[PDB]
Design a protein around this ligand. Sequence first.
Ligand code: NA
Ligand code: NA
Lengths: 52, 50, 123, 257, 143
Amino acid sequence: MNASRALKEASMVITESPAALQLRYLQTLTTIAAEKNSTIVFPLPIDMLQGI
Amino acid sequence: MNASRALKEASMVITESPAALQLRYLQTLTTIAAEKNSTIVFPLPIDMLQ
Amino acid sequence: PQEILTKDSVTISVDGVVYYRVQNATLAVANITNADSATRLLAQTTLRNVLGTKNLSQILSDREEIAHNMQSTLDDATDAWGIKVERVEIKDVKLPVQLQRAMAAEAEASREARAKVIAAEGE
Amino acid sequence: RLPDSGPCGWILVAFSFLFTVITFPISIWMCIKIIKEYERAIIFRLGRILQGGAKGPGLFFILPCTDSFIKVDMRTISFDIPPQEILTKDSVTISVDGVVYYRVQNATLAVANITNADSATRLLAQTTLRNVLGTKNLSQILSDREEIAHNMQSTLDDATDAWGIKVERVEIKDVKLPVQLQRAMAAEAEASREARAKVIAAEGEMNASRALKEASMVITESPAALQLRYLQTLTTIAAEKNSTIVFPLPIDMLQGI
Amino acid sequence: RLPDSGPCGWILVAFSFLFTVITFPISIWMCIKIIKEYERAIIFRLGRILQGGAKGPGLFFILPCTDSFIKVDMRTISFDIPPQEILTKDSVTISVDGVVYYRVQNATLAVANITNADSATRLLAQTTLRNVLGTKNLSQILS
Ligand code: NA
Ligand code: NA
């Protein structure tokens, strides 16, 4: 409950240029990769899959 | 039962803007990654513009 | 040290101390074979029993009540030996390693709640 | 305040007077006792305690046959308590490393009412510290020294009074969490630095964006250029010391089924 | 201020004088004391401290049979504290390695009011450092 207001404020800015959320997504991946754990990553060419 | 009221208040604020809940998801993932023996499988949808 | 079970069935090991004195030298010699050994074993069993009637949270909060309970048991037993037990106290308490992080959940959660507010401000 | 715990005497005393005088140049050294300003003496003669309080500083005479003599230091003493295992009110496992300061307040009780004043006092300090910290949350333990000290003092005074002891301080020199809890409990500090890092990272995205747009506008004029960039990325990744799995995928063969 | 802690005198002192004079070529080296500017002495005569404050620099005479002599260095001392494990206000585990500087400012109290002044001081420094850093966030500790 205490954290919710700031997340709403952040969301209202981010949605005005929605690709910003993908930038946040990619920075999350960089943070996770640094931890001492196994990470498996799948680059996925969706327009190639859209063809079949 | 005791926790439900606060979750409702948090939910009502979060759902007023669409990206907010997604930010909560990504922060959870960052919290998970610090625990031992936590494998994360991560898709990267990419467009080659054909 | 002793191995103990609480009322809520938590396994804990405790490390006690006892204080006592002779108050009737005639009974201490002629009514019991070894007054010191008898007293020290009685202290252990009395501590074992009382803590089994308490939840772990009560053990941390109810020193005065626990002391009052033990004294009645000790006085009834030690009168015939010419002994007065003055205190039984606990020096250490330990959880098994497998239980330690699980039981600490409230403290972990409180710091995690403050972290979330900081992180949301970052976003 | 006394502790809670004849004709033939003159014969023994006289025998002792005679014997010491008969042995004077040797035995007078045993008879003579000197007590310093900061010391006190408890003296028994034929088992009875000499009347009044503990004997003060100065020169004193005793007979080693009939008399027994105990000398008490009245100065403050400090002891380094062995480390302890403790549970907080919020059930956190911590180990603490204490120190206690204490002083003899009444020399008669310290001698004649307790078998070993030091060990009794040192054990009592440990159990009192164990109890008080069990009534506090971990955050309170770090913030509430004055309240914690006040709580302990009243407990200690009620017990040590009968022993003639005054405890002056109990303090902690180390506190440790077990290794499994250390990163979890540090969440608030870790989050603050990550929050500042995120702002720095977003400024980096903004600064780099213009050049990526310029690169994109050239690349899109012959879109197969992006596939060339894709293949050079794969070559870079394969050179790292990590596992790579590659799937050649004949899409026109899949298009047939 | 003082610490919170006759015929037989004359006779015993007189005996000591005679003994030391009879042993004069041996006694010279034990009965005479010299105190530097940066030192003070605490002297007990038959268990009673000599009147006034601690004895200053100079030449002094001690009857070893009746008298006890303690000299105190008044200069600054530095000590390398062993490392400690600490928790910050934000609950970060850190280990710190400290140093303390101190000096005696009243030689009478240092001798007669505490059993071991140095050990008491060094332990007190450790606990004081432990407490204060527990009231500070890690960023405040650095700044
Ligand atoms: Na200690
Ligand atoms: Na040091």
